[PDB]
Structure formats: structure tokens, C-alpha cells
């Protein structure tokens with residue numbers, strides 16, 4: 001599923017991401033935009049052989065099991081393919097554990113490089129939230 005901007009914002013708000021650990025909703029929409037272009041089926045391979053999955057590009061090195069990242073962890077206790085669903089519940093619940101691990105949203109390289117220090121509230125402008 002490719003989400004619309006306000007559609008994703010509404011779904012993220014319903015699932016409790018607005019101001020989670022102090023990050024306003026615009027941060028999460030901005031991160032999703034530049035991580036996956038709002039596409040739940042997005043995948044990208046990393047140099048160490050791990051793979052990033054879904055709308056927030058969650059990494060198989062630490063967070064999910066894809067059967068092909070030997071020596072890695074599965075801290076969200078899910079198969080990585082669950083992160084590609086049109087239902088974003090698994091991605092949001094796993095994202096909540098990542099952002100709580102001490103580094104905040106700096107865990108997402110696209111957020112630090114393209115969202116942090118910008119007017120992230122612009123990403124929800126116009127939405128009925």
C-alpha cells in the first residue's frame with residue numbers, strides 16, 4: 001500500500017505516535033516520506049547484509065527476523081515480512097521500541113539528515129486530524 005500523506009498521519013495518530021517520546025506527528029510523517037516514500041512494501045539492503053523493511057525501513061540487524069541475517073537480533077519479535085503489510089500496526093509498535101532505545105529518532109538516518117531541524121509540522125498541514 002502507498003499511503004496518502006494525511007491518511008498516514010491519521011493512522012499514525014490513531015496508533016499513538018503523536019508526541020510519542022516527545023516527537024510530534026510531523027516528525028513521523030517526514031521520516032516515512034524519506035525512508036519509504038509512504039510505501040509499505042519498500043525494502044532496501046544494507047552493506048552488512050541486513051535489510052530494511054516497510055514504511056519506516058526497520059532493520060533486520062536488530063529488530064526483525066527475515067531468515068537471511070545470521071547473527072542478528074529480533075527485538076520486535078516479528079518476521080520482517082509483517083512490516084510490509086498494509087496494516088501498519090506492527091511497524092508502529094516496533095518503531096515505539098526503537099525510539100525508546102536511547103537514541104530517539106536519530107535511529108532513522110533519513111530523519112536526521114532530512115527532517116531534523118526543519119519545519120516538520122509542514123508535513124501535516126491541511127490534514128483533518
Ligand code: NA
Pocket residue numbers: 060061062063064065066069072073074
Ligand atoms: Na534479525
